[PDB]
Amino acid sequence: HHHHSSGLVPRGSHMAGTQAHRRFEYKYSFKGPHLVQSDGTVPFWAHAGNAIPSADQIRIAPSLKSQRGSVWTKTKAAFENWEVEVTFRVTGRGRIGADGLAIWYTENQGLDGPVFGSADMWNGVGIFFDSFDNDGKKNNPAIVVVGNNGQINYDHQNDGATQALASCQRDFRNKPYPVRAKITYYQKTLTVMINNGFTPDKNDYEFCAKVENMVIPTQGHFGISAATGGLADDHDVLSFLTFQLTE
Ligand SMILES: [Ca+2]
Ligand SMILES: [Ca+2]
Numbered sequence: 444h445h446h447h448s449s450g451l452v453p454r455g456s457h458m459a460g461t462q463a464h465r466r467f468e469y470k471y472s473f474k475g476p477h478l479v480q481s482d483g484t485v486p487f488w489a490h491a492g493n494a495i496p497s498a499d500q501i502r503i504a505p506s507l508k509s510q511r512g513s514v515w516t517k518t519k520a521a522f523e524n525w526e527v528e529v530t531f532r533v534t535g536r537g538r539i540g541a542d543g544l545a546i547w548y549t550e551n552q553g554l555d556g557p558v559f560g561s562a563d564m565w566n567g568v569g570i571f572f573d574s575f576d577n578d579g580k581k582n583n584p585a586i587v588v589v590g591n592n593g594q595i596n597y598d599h600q601n602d603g604a605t606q607a608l609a610s611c612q613r614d615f616r617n618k619p620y621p622v623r624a625k626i627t628y629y630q631k632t633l634t635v636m637i638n639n640g641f642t643p644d645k646n647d648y649e650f651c652a653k654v655e656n657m658v659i660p661t662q663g664h665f666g667i668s669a670a671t672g673g674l675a676d677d678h679d680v681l682s683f684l685t686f687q688l689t690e
Contacts, residue, residue, distance in 0.1 A: 444689055465526070466687045471516050471665055474530075474682035475499045490514045491554040492668075503544065504560060504669040504678045506535060511560040513668035514680070515552040521662045524688035526627045529667065533574065533616045535676035540616055541575035543584070544678050546626060547666035548659060558597045560668035566593045567663050570626060570635060572615055575672065577602050585612050586624075586635060586651055590659070609652035613637055621681055623648070629688055633657045 447469050450458075454469070457477075461467045473485050479496045480486055490496055494503045494512030503512040529546055545559035548568050553561030559571060569589045576583035578601045587603050587610040598605055615622045618640035625648055627634040632655050636648040665685060669678035 461684055464688060464690070466689070468520070468522075468525075468685040468687050470518075471520055471685035472683060473501075474684065478682075485514065487517055488514050489517055489552070489554075492560060500532075500679045500681050502677060502679050503667065504671050504675075506671065506675040506677045508671055508673060508675050510671040510675065511555060511668075512670075512678075513554060513560045513666060514683075515554065515666040516664045519550075519662040519664055520548075520685070520687075522628075522687045524629045526625065526629075526686045526688055527665060528682075528684045528686075529624045529626070530621050530681040530683075531615075531624075532618070532621055532679045532681070533572070533676045534679070535616065535674070537674070539575070539674060540676035541672040541674040542670045543571060543573040543575065544669040544680075545572065545667065546570045546624065547668065548628075548663045549666065550660045550663050552664050553666060553668065557599070558668075560670040561666065563597055564593050564595065565591045567591065567660050568633065568657070570624070571603060572624075573602050574616055574676065575602075575674070578604065580604075582612055584614050584616060585610055586615075586637065588633065588635065588652055588654055590654075590657065608654045608657070609635075611635070611637075611651040613639060613651060615639065616676065627688075628657075628659065631656045631658075633659075 492512040550566040556562035623638035
C-alpha cells in the first residue's frame with residue numbers, strides 16, 4: 444500500500460502502462476526499451492553466467508552448447524501476496540530444443556548452478572519451462588512447479604516429475620509473438636497462467652496450473668535463469684514486472 448516515490452519522471456513515463464488490489468513494484472521489475480543503463484547493468488538486478496543484457500532484452504542463455512545464465516533482484520521482497528508477469532522467447536532451429544528457462548522466488552540468489560542455470564537445493568519455488576524430454580515420456584515442452592526447502596536435489600532426468608507439485612504441457616517454443624507467464628501468490632494459493640504467443644493480445648491468458656495452500660518463505664529474491672545442453676535455444680526475457688497485492 445502507498446504509491447512508489449523513489450522514481451524519476453522519465454521512468455514514471457516509461458512504466459506508465461504498468462502504474463495505471465494491484466500495486467506496481469518498480470524496484471523488482473525491468474523492461475525495454477532501454478532495458479539497460481549506459482554502464483551495461485539492469486537497474487535493481489544482478490546478472491551472472493552467460494547472461495547478457497541489452498537495450499531490448501536480456502539473452503539469458505544464447506544458442507551455444509552447455510550455457511548457463513541468470514538474473515536476480517539485488518534485494519529481497521517481503522510481500523504477503525504478489526504477482527509477476529514475465530515476457531520471454533525461446534527460439535531455436537528445429538522442433539526439439541534444450542534445456543529451458545526457470546522463474547524463481549527463493550530465499551537466496553541462485554547465481555549459478557545445475558538447475559536451469561541456477562542453484563540446486565533452493566528454499567522456495569521454481570516454475571520450470573522445461574523444453575527437453577529427459578525421461579522419454581513424450582510430454583515436453585512442459586511447465587512444472589517445484590517447491591523446495593533446501594533439502595531436495597532436482598531430479599533432472601525425470602523432468603522433475605517425482606517432485607512436482609503441479610504441471611501442464613504447453614509448447615512455449617518458436618512462437619510468432621512473445622510468450623507470457625503470469626504467476627500469482629494470493630491467500631496461500633500459487634497460480635500459473637500462460638499467454639502462448641499466438642495472438643497480438645497481451646492479456647490472452649490461459650490457466651495452466653495451481654497449488655492450493657502452498658508455503659513459501661516470508662522474504663525472497665525474484666529471479667530468472669536458463670541453460671542449454673546438446674541442443675541449444677536462445678532464451679530471451681523481454682520484461683519482468685512485479686506487483687504487490689492487497690486484501
Ligand atoms: Ca528436461
Ligand atoms: Ca518428460
